[PDB]
Amino acid sequence: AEFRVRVSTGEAFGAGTWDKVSVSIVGTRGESPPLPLDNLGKEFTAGAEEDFQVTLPEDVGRVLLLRVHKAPPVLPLLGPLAPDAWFCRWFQLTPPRGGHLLFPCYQWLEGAGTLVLQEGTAKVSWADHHPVLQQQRQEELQARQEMYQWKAYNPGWPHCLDEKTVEDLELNIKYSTAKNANFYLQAGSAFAEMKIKGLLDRKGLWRSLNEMKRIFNFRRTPAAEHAFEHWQEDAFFASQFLNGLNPVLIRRCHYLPKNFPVTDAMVASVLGPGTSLQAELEKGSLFLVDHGILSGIQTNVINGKPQFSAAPMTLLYQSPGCGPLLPLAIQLSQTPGPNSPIFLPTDDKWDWLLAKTWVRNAEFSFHEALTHLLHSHLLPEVFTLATLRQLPHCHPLFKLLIPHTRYTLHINTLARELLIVPGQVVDRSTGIGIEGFSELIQRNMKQLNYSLLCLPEDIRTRGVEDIPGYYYRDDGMQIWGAVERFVSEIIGIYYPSDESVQDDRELQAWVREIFSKGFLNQESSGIPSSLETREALVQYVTMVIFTCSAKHAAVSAGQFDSCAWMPNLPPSMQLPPPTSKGLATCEGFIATLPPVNATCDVILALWLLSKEPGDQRPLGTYPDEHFTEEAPRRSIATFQSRLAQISRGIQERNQGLVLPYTYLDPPLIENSVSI
Template sequence: MAEYTLEVTTGSMLYAGTFDNLYVTLIGTERQSEHTQLTSLGLDDKTEYVSEHWKDDDFFGYQLLNGFNFFLIQRCSKLPSNFPVTEEMVKPFLANGSSLTEEMQKGNIFINDYKIMEGLPTKVINGKPIPVTAAICLLYLNPEGKLLPIAIQLGQHPSEETPIFLPSDLESDWLLAKIFVKNANVLYFQVINHLQNTHLLAEVFTMATLRNLPMIHPLHTLLIPHHRYTLHINIIARALLYGPGRILGNISIGADGVTELMRRGLSQMTYTSLCLPDNIAARGVESIPGFYYRDDALKLWSIINSFVKAMVAYYYPSDSEVSADSELQGWIKEIFHYGFLGNGDSGIPSRFQTVAELIKFVTTVIFVSSVQHAAVNGGQFDFQGWIPNAPFGLHQAPPTTKGQSSIEAILATLPNKSHAGHSMSILWQLSEKYSDFVPLGIYPKQRFDEAAALQMIKDFQAELSSLSVAITKRNSELELPYNYLNPKEIENSVTI
């Protein structure tokens, strides 16, 4: 793997690969005025924006919508029993005269609960386990449309040693609490949302297609472009990522923790969580303003669904033809058995009875293999490349009291320069666009011969092109453009 360095020019001093000094510059109360030059890793304007705003509460909330992990946030209509936030605690951060109860009734209170992280095995360094926190974070959508964190508990069990941190606390206390949330957030994202729910799930779809659907089967013809290179990248990933001493073995939860987190994630995966419109409704996040991932992804779901509906209805005019197709039934049976371990509670179908059922599932397959992967992969370096914003490992336990933290404590908690540099180089490579990139809806090899099917593809491409224009126009008016789901930036399949 190529070596990359971060060069920071501050006055007459040059630090090559030394992250400690850069941390001090941007964590300190006063930002230094000297010019900071980011080179070698190709840090663009967005990464610099992150490095400048990562401490801001409104940017913290923005990232839970448009950063990289937008799958956990949900509307909160009742506080969990293990999260004893009181009206008095958060009243200063709500609209004048309002209360937490009133804001929950209005649908303005949201929560990110990392309960799934509780009790995971972690790496041990110098005889000391690396901390991973099952945090709970409460957020408020204020009258200006900004999503702000208003309470953080660094654990699932409230006690005197697990205080609830508030924005009014000591600045370093509040920042440290947010850093522990960011750590849980990026671990959950990389293991469950990225690796398991796109890469490995797309592999299940790919294998089932290759094993059950002949090349002349219309569904094979429709899906095979969306399986391109998926097996190849996952084979490489297994060689580089899994196991002791490999990349995922070096993050804070280690190889055993990754395996356990994936086991928990799979047990919680449902058909509802994979079907975007159902997912958005189930979490109650339909009306949060500035949720660009949601807006663009729902439009893409609709476009893909319309394309799939036309294609499937053309080859399967009736429900009876779906239920009678033994190859099709073998395909979904294998996905249900091997991908979801035969878990009927997941809602994943084990058999297709109707055309509508087939359309919904094929839409899900294409969406996961293209749109969803683009959404989670595209912004990795932008948001995680600035290590304090998304640390893969912390070296100190979460604070158990208030008023005892400092900048020095934060620096001791963050990853050291070796871990930070290694993470940055990997994230940069994962975010690169390669020369053989094939955008969503582009099929270099003509696989269909029927005029009707070819026209459906043209209509699909036209819809995607129109959406691309609309997203480009919207982005031109945003301080921080959201371009990860511009159809021109979405690859047809999981390839990196």
């Protein structure tokens, strides 16, 4: 007859509420009326965990749902006051004579809304067949699909959330006021420094390479300083293909592309007289970085001056015995010929240095448009938006995936509002501009592939499983294994067979929506449009979580470290690539680099997008307990202690490196894409 209702309120700003809360307990035998949760003094203060003794007029049997109503106080002859938004963490019912019932919530309640909560026990559609519970699932997803809808942003792009401004978003997918404040303070302060220094308003060349060091007065990091110390070095130019900003392109080469006519004579110096180009190709010691996708891309106008982009090809040589990876040849065009020289390290100073810089510029355009924006933001959004629409609150995958979706819809809405719009940093200060970004995404979407998204398949495909000093791989694979083991445990707990995976209609709709809205129903993407086995499910889910956390962390963390010394990552180029050799000079080199304002505007932007604003949410840390059962909680503990072991391994490893790799240290990896 009696019931103890324990309720936890959020600690966030505004989490508390002055409004009155009432609950209706629904059971197999029936539903109770609205029951008040009103004790002496104020309840539902921010961070509060309070008990309420409630009594039901009659029996309800086994508890099924928990309907939570909220209404503002009611003055006689004045009506209600005003809605006071309330964030609820969880409910807990305790009937006689014992046995607790935990109802996880973790969402905002507003106005005359009604929160319907199931017991914390995760349940697939075929888990509990009670019609009251099936009705709850169906009506919930119906509401979700109405709340969060799709729209086409551009042709050939993945679809996105149908919201124009960040203000139109629901509270449940918004930045916390804390995180947002922290973010805008950091930005306003950063912009102020760069602005008052008059650098955002300087149209023209840097007076010298030395003046470019002024960036280190704005912001400063050891890795950024290190880039300036060694940017001219070949080993550093090459190593950044492995442990730098964009470590996903390098791949082993047994057959040199015909449009890249490197001869044995061109590489005889570096390789030595002991072998030849063909011999080393067969050895598997030669690797290639091909920015061909940039070929003929649309370019931007900066300060009324037409900008330029190359689409280079870089041949690299991995010297024996853990020696350095060294560049052999660079061609700055996809079309060979006398007007596109193959530059060697044996060329003069500025020819070779100019050639390398062009490749670094290609890395920028490629990284930010495809590796960062498309792969580490747009696809995670699709995963997020599909998850919200197709997987209900009580579904195991929702419980698993929901922390890895936090703020993703928010940050992307922000980008579409303030990043890739006219007048803003991309349009303003990048070489390829808005149309270039779009054109790249459009091309890449037509040849995307499931294997690149799954790290073990990615490393295998590119044939870089054994290349030394590849820390993005080394650390990335350990984390992937950890996530894969974590996911397989969760799947093993809830899905007893492959048939049980096939019959999950909600799961199949989830994969199908990602395939449709995310990858445009392209079979050539190699991405599943359905999941027929548990093995496939484990891999797919692992790919999602990994993409939303470590992948973004790996390609985001190094942005400022890489761009702070601008010659190491020029956002644009102001002259076309050289057509002859022996023309490059220091004066010409600076004339080719972007103007001061474009330089500092991009650096300002990348510095802000490198750091996770506000409080952190480390990978594998889930303060929101959606999983209330024991078995999933063990899996979380295992996943957490493993990440710690992986971390400690990375500390030891980095301790003996002049330039450590920290971008994949688990404590520094966010659960989701949020910046």
